[PDB]
Amino acid sequence: DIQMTQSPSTLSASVGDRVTITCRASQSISRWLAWYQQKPGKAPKLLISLASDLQTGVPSRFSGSGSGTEFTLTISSLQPDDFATYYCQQFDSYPLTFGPGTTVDIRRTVAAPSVFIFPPSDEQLKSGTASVVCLLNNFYPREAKVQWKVDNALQSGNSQESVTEQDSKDSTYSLSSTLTLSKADYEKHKVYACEVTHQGLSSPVTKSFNRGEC
Amino acid sequence: KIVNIGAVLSTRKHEQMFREAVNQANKRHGSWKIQLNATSVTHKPNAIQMALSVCEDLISSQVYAILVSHPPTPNDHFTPTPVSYTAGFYRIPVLGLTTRMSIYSDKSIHLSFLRTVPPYSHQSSVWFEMMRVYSWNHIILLVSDDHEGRAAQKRLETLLEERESKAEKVLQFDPGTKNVTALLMEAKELEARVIILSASEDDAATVYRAAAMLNMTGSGYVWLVGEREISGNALRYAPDGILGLQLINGKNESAHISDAVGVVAQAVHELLEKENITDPPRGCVGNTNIWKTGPLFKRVLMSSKYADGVTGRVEFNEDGDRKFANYSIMNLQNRKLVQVGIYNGTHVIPNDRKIIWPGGETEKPRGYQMSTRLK
Amino acid sequence: LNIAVMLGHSHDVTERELRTLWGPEQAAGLPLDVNVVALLMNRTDPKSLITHVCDLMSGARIHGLVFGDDTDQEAVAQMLDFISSHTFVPILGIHGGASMIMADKDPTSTFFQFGASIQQQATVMLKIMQDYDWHVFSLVTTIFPGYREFISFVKTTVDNSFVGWDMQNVITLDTSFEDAKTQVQLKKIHSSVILLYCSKDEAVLILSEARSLGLTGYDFFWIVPSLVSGNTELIPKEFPSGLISVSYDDWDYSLEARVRDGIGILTTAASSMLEKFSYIPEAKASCYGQMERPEVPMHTLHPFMVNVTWDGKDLSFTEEGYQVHPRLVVIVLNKDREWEKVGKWENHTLSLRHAVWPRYKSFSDCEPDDNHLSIVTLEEAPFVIVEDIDPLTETCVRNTVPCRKFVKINNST
Amino acid sequence: EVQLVESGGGLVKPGGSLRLSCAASGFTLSDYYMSWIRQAPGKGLEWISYISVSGTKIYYADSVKGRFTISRDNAKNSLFLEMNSLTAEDTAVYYCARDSGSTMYDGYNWFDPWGQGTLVTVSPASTKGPSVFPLAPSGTAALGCLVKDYFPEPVTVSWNSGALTSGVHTFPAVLQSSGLYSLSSVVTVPSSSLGTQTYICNVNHKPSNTKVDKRVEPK
Ligand SMILES: *[C@@H]1O[C@H](CO)[C@@H](O[C@@H]2O[C@H](CO)[C@@H](O)[C@H](O)[C@H]2NC(C)=O)[C@H](O)[C@H]1NC(C)=O
Ligand SMILES: *[C@@H]1O[C@H](CO)[C@@H](O[C@@H]2O[C@H](CO)[C@@H](O)[C@H](O)[C@H]2NC(C)=O)[C@H](O)[C@H]1NC(C)=O
Ligand SMILES: *[C@@H]1O[C@H](CO)[C@@H](O)[C@H](O)[C@H]1NC(C)=O
Ligand SMILES: *[C@@H]1O[C@H](CO)[C@@H](O)[C@H](O)[C@H]1NC(C)=O
C-alpha cells in the first residue's frame, strides 16, 4: 500500500491570498496524483490530474507541482468558494488510497478557548450510564489537544469528541468531548479533570469538580 | 543459461503485471529449467535521473531486452528518449509498448529501437487506403513543421507517387501558431475540398477554432484527421462530421506488455538455439565495447513472428514497427465518437452505420468541384 | 563564459590552455572570459559521460563545453544531444563520436556538430561527378534506414535541370545479396561511376560481390559517402583501388585547430548574446530536482549562432544544425591502398582539382588499359578551337570535348 | 448532462444484505470504467471496488474482499453493487464515480464525475425514543441540553421554540458503539440572565414522533 500524509491537517487563509497544500507519499509515485475539492455535504470534485494538469471547467487559480514523494497544490488567489476539504489521491498501485485531507478555513484572530466541564445529571445516573462532557467554545485555530484526567490519572480509549463546522458569523469552532464511565467507575472516583491545550492559552487550564457539591 | 529481462513501465501496477506476464511465459510454451529473470524500474521524473537509474539498475543486472512505455502526459514529457539513448550506446534492443512518436522510426537517431505499435506512418497509410476506397483524388494536406509531421507527409507523398498521383499543394504549419487563417484561406482557394491534417492536440484545437469562423465546416469539406486530433481540446473543438482514426488496443498497455514479453522470450529461445551469445556487460561504466550479438538479436526480434498474441498476426517492418495493425475509423456524430469501420490491413470494411459528413449532408460528397473562375 | 573542453588524446592540458588564451586575446573580445577548464578521459560510457557533464554543469556554471571523444561510436553524439536538450548547455561536436552527424536534433536542444550531413556530402559527390565528365550513374543502396533521405535528395537533384549537367537515366537498387540483382540493371546504365550507399561491412560485402562480378577494372568507378570510409587507416582488401570517398579528416586540420575554432565560435555567440539585450545567460543550479517543466526563461543561442564571423574563417550553422561551410574533403584510394586528399570543398562551396587528372588506378586485378589512349592536340585556328567552360546552366561541355591547358606568367618560372 | 445518481441506500441491520444502484446519464456506461468508493464519517475516503469495461476484470479492496459483489448492466446503463455481512464500520457514504482509463492511459482514474451519493447506516436498533438530560451549570454562563440514545436521524433541537438562536452551538450527531446517536446543543447566555429568565429547550424527533421539553435552571 501507499501512505500519503498531508500537513497541516487544517489551515486558515484570507480571500485573495495564496494557499499552499503539501502532500507527501510514503514511497515514490512519480507524478501519479490527483486533487479533489469536497464541500461539506457534497461529493468531491476533481481539480488537478497528474498533479499538474488542470481539469476542464476548473478555475485557473488551481495549479499543482512536485513529483516523486512530495507534491504541492497552489492556489493563486483564494476565493470564498475555494474553502473546502482537499484530498490528494494516488493511483500508483492497487489499492487506490486517499490522503487524510486538508481543509481551508478563514483566518480572523486568535481566540481564547472557553473551557467548561459539566458533571453528569442525576437523571442520567439513575439510568445506569454516566458520561462526562467537557465544553470547548470560540477557539482558533480548530486544532487543539484534549485529554481526560480522572483522579490525576490519564484516561484513554473511552472518549468521544464532536467538533462543529466553522460558524458563518464569528467563525468560532465548538468541540464537545464525552468521557464514558460505568456507574461503579463514576462512584469510585472523586476527581474528573478536563485539560485543554490550545494556541489561545499560554499554559493549559485544568478545571475539575469534586464529588459531594458538584 | 540464466537470462534477465529488464523493463521500464509506469510504476508498481504495470511492473507487477509485467512480472506476472513473465512468469506466465516462463510456465507456458517454451519452459526450460532456467528461462529468464524479471526486472523493472519506474519512470523517473527527471530524464537524466531516469537514464542513470536505467543504466545502473539494468546493465548491471545483465539485461538482454528492455521494455519501455510512453505515458501520454501532456505537460511533462516522460518520453522513452533517455532509455532508448542509453540502450543505444550498446546494442541492447528495446520494445515500445505505446511509443506513438515518429522520432524512433528512424534508426539513424535510435540505433536499436523496436515497438509493437505503428506511430503515425501506418496511420497515413490508412488515410491513403481510405481515400482510395472512397475515391478521393483531391487532398489538402496540412502538416506541422515537426519531425512526425514531415515523416507523415513524406510517407503520404510516396504512397501517392505509387499510383502517379500528387496533391495540388501541401500547406506548411508551424506549431504553437495562432495566425493560421491565411493558410486556411489558401486552402479554401483551391479545387480540392477534402482536408487531411496531422498536428498535436493544441494545434488541432487552434486550427479548428480558426476554421470554424471561415465556413470550413460546411458540406463537401471532408476531414481525415488522425488520433491526436480527436482527443482533449481537439475533441472539444472538433467540427461535426470528422472521420477520425483510433487505434484498436493501442491504449491497453497490458496487452502490449504481454505481447512484448512473448516476443522477447521467443527471440531469446531462437538466439540461444541459433549460435553462441556474448555475455552482456557487467556494468555500464568502464566498458565502451559495442555488443557483438546486439545486431543479431535485433535481426531475430525483427524477423520473429508471434501468432499467439492478442492482436493476431504480429510482425515487424524494416524499421521495427508493427505491421498490419487494427485501426478503427471513428466518426463524430452529435459530438459523440461513433465507430464505423475497422482497418484490418490492406482492407477497409465499414459496418452498417451510416457515415455522416460536415454540414449535415446525408449523401456522400465529392472533392471534384469546378471553380469556373479560371484566372 | 566559463567554457569547458574535453579531449581523448594528443594535447592534454597545456596546448589547449595556450590556445584558449590566444583565441580571445587575438581580438577586442567584449565578453570577459575569465578562464577555461580542460578535462581528459579515455572511456566514454553513457553514465560516466552524464556524471562528468553534470559535474561540469554544477561547478563553473558550465556555460558550454567542447567534446573531444576518440571512440568511433555514433551514439556519443546522440547522448550529447540528449544532455544538451535536457540541461540547456551548448555543446559543439568535434572529431570522434560527435563528429559524425546523422540525427535530427529536437528544437529544445542546443547541440551542434562540425560534421557534414548526407545532404552536403551528396552535393560534394555531385560536384565530383560534374568534374571528370561523369553524367550517367546508378544508385546501389542497402536496407539501411538512413539512406531513404539520400535517395530522395538524389531524385530531387535529378529533377533539378535548370542548371548543372544533363541527368542521365538513374536506377535505384535496394535488396539483399541474393536474387542475382545488381547485374540485372547494371548493363547499360552503369557505364560511368556507380554510387554505393552501404555501411562498412555492407559495403565490403557489396564490393566483394562486385569483384566476383563484372563491376571492377579500369571501367566505371565507385563513389561512396563519408561513413563508408569511416576509418582512414583500416582499408579492407575488398575495397578497389579506384574507390572515391568524401570525408573531412585531420589531413588538413587538427584537434588543436578544431577546438580553437570551436571556442572562438562559442565566445562569439556569447558576445552576441551579451550585446543583444543585457547580458550573457547563466545555467541552472544542477541536473537534479527539476520537478517543474523544463522552461527556458532565457533566450537560446540559435539566433546568435546562425550567422557568426571569426577572423575570415567563419563557421556558420544552419537551422537543421550542420555547419554551412564544412571542410568535407574528397579522398581517392591510392594504388598502395591509402586515402590521399585530392580536392577540397571549402572554397565558396566549390570543389577543387588538386592538379590530379583521373589517372586510372589499377583495380584488384591488373588489366591492360589500352582503351583511353593519349591524344596531343594543338589549337591552330579552323580545326581546333579552345574555349573555357561557360559559367551558366551546364557549366560543362555541350558539343565539344573536355580539354587541358597550361599557364605562363614568368619566363624564369 | 453527465451526472450520476446513487439509489438503494438505507438502514440495514448487521449481517443483512443491501443493493446499491448507480444511474448513468449523459454518456454510455460501456465506454468507461466504474468504481465504488465509500467515505466513513469523520474519516477519509476509501476506494472499494473496480469494474472493467469487458466485465471480466473485477478487483476488490483487501479490507472488504470477499464480502461485496459488483455488477454492471451496459444495456441499462446502470451499476449494481451487492453488499453482504454488513458491520458497524461499514457505515459510510457511498459514491459511484467514473474512471478515465479509456480515453487516457491505463491506471489513470482521477475519479470524475461524482454523484450526489447515498448514506448507508448499519445499526442493530430500529427506532428508539430520544432521552434529554439537562446540563446543569457548575460574563456568560454555558447552558445546554444533552440528547442521548436516540435513533434514527434526524432530531430537531431548538431553544425557546426557536426564539433563542444566538449563541446556540448544536454539535453534530455522533454514532456510538451501541448504534444509538447522541448530540449536544449548548447556548451561551449572560450570567445575569440566569435564574431571572427561564430557559427551555425543545427537542423533537421526527421518526419517533416524540417531543420532549426539559427545564433548565441554575444549579
Ligand atoms: C533477478 O531479478 C531480481 C529482481 O527482484 C533480483 O533481485 C533483486 O531485486 C531487488 C528488488 O526487489 C533489486 O533492487 C535488486 O537490484 C535485485 N538484485 C540484483 C542483484 O540486481 C535478482 O538479483 C535477479 N537475479 C539475477 C541473477 O539477475
Ligand atoms: C487488455 O489486454 C489484456 C490482454 O493482455 C486483456 O485481458 C485481460 O488482462 C488482464 C491483465 O492484463 C487480466 O487480469 C484479465 O483477466 C484479462 N481478461 C481477459 C478476458 O483475458 C484485457 O481484457 C484488456 N483490457 C481492455 C480494457 O481492453
Ligand atoms: C492575423 O492577425 C490576427 C491575430 O494576430 C488574426 O485574427 C487574423 O485573422 C490574422 N490575419 C489574417 C489576414 O487572417
Ligand atoms: C483483414 O486483414 C488481415 C490482414 O491483417 C487479413 O488476414 C484478413 O483476411 C482481412 N479480412 C478481410 C475480411 O479481408
Short mmCIF file of N, CA and C in Angstrom, two decimals, chain A residues 27-28 30-32 50 52-53 56 67-68 91-94 96, chain B residues 10-13 42-45 71-76 78 236:
data_model
loop_
_atom_site.label_atom_id
_atom_site.label_comp_id
_atom_site.label_asym_id
_atom_site.label_seq_id
_atom_site.Cartn_x
_atom_site.Cartn_y
_atom_site.Cartn_z
N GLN A 27 6.14 6.28 -0.42
CA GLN A 27 7.05 5.83 -1.46
C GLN A 27 7.05 6.83 -2.62
N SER A 28 7.81 6.50 -3.66
CA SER A 28 7.90 7.33 -4.85
C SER A 28 6.81 6.93 -5.84
N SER A 30 6.22 9.00 -8.70
CA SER A 30 6.49 9.84 -9.87
C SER A 30 5.57 11.05 -9.91
N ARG A 31 4.60 11.04 -10.84
CA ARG A 31 3.67 12.15 -10.98
C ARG A 31 2.22 11.68 -11.00
N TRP A 32 1.93 10.51 -10.43
CA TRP A 32 0.58 9.96 -10.45
C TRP A 32 -0.14 10.38 -9.18
N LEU A 50 -2.86 14.28 -12.80
CA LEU A 50 -1.41 14.08 -12.94
C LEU A 50 -0.60 15.05 -12.09
N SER A 52 -0.35 18.02 -12.04
CA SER A 52 -0.04 19.29 -12.68
C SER A 52 -1.03 19.73 -13.75
N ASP A 53 -1.90 18.86 -14.25
CA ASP A 53 -2.79 19.20 -15.36
C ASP A 53 -4.12 19.71 -14.82
N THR A 56 -10.80 20.58 -17.11
CA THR A 56 -11.70 21.49 -17.79
C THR A 56 -12.84 21.90 -16.86
N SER A 67 6.85 16.22 -7.68
CA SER A 67 6.85 14.88 -8.23
C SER A 67 7.66 13.97 -7.32
N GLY A 68 7.45 12.67 -7.48
CA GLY A 68 8.17 11.68 -6.70
C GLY A 68 7.50 11.33 -5.39
N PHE A 91 -2.76 6.98 -7.77
CA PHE A 91 -3.15 5.78 -8.49
C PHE A 91 -1.93 4.99 -8.94
N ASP A 92 -0.88 4.99 -8.12
CA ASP A 92 0.34 4.27 -8.47
C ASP A 92 0.12 2.76 -8.45
N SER A 93 -0.49 2.24 -7.38
CA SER A 93 -0.67 0.81 -7.24
C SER A 93 -1.95 0.52 -6.48
N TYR A 94 -2.51 -0.66 -6.74
CA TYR A 94 -3.69 -1.09 -6.01
C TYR A 94 -3.32 -1.47 -4.58
N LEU A 96 -6.19 1.76 -4.44
CA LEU A 96 -6.09 3.20 -4.55
C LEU A 96 -6.50 3.84 -3.22
N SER B 10 5.07 1.94 -16.03
CA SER B 10 4.51 3.00 -15.19
C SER B 10 4.27 2.47 -13.78
N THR B 11 5.36 2.46 -13.00
CA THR B 11 5.34 2.18 -11.57
C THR B 11 4.84 0.78 -11.22
N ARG B 12 4.26 0.65 -10.02
CA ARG B 12 4.13 -0.65 -9.38
C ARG B 12 3.11 -1.55 -10.08
N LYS B 13 1.96 -1.00 -10.48
CA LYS B 13 0.91 -1.85 -11.04
C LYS B 13 1.34 -2.49 -12.35
N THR B 42 10.65 2.12 -12.34
CA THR B 42 9.66 3.13 -12.66
C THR B 42 10.28 4.28 -13.46
N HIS B 43 9.42 4.99 -14.19
CA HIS B 43 9.84 6.16 -14.95
C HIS B 43 10.14 7.30 -13.98
N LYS B 44 11.41 7.67 -13.87
CA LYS B 44 11.79 8.77 -13.00
C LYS B 44 11.33 10.10 -13.60
N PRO B 45 11.05 11.10 -12.75
CA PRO B 45 10.60 12.40 -13.29
C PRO B 45 11.65 13.07 -14.17
N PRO B 71 4.03 7.03 -21.32
CA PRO B 71 2.77 7.56 -20.77
C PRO B 71 2.43 8.89 -21.40
N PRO B 72 1.19 9.07 -21.86
CA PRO B 72 0.81 10.30 -22.58
C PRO B 72 0.46 11.45 -21.64
N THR B 73 1.44 11.88 -20.85
CA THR B 73 1.25 13.07 -20.03
C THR B 73 1.39 14.32 -20.89
N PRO B 74 0.41 15.22 -20.88
CA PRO B 74 0.52 16.40 -21.76
C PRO B 74 1.56 17.41 -21.31
N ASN B 75 1.60 17.74 -20.01
CA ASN B 75 2.51 18.77 -19.54
C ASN B 75 3.95 18.27 -19.52
N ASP B 76 4.17 17.07 -19.00
CA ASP B 76 5.51 16.51 -18.90
C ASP B 76 5.81 15.65 -20.13
N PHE B 78 8.06 12.54 -20.21
CA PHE B 78 8.04 11.12 -19.86
C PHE B 78 8.25 10.24 -21.09
N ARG B 236 -12.80 18.65 -28.15
CA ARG B 236 -13.77 19.65 -27.71
C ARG B 236 -14.14 20.60 -28.85
#
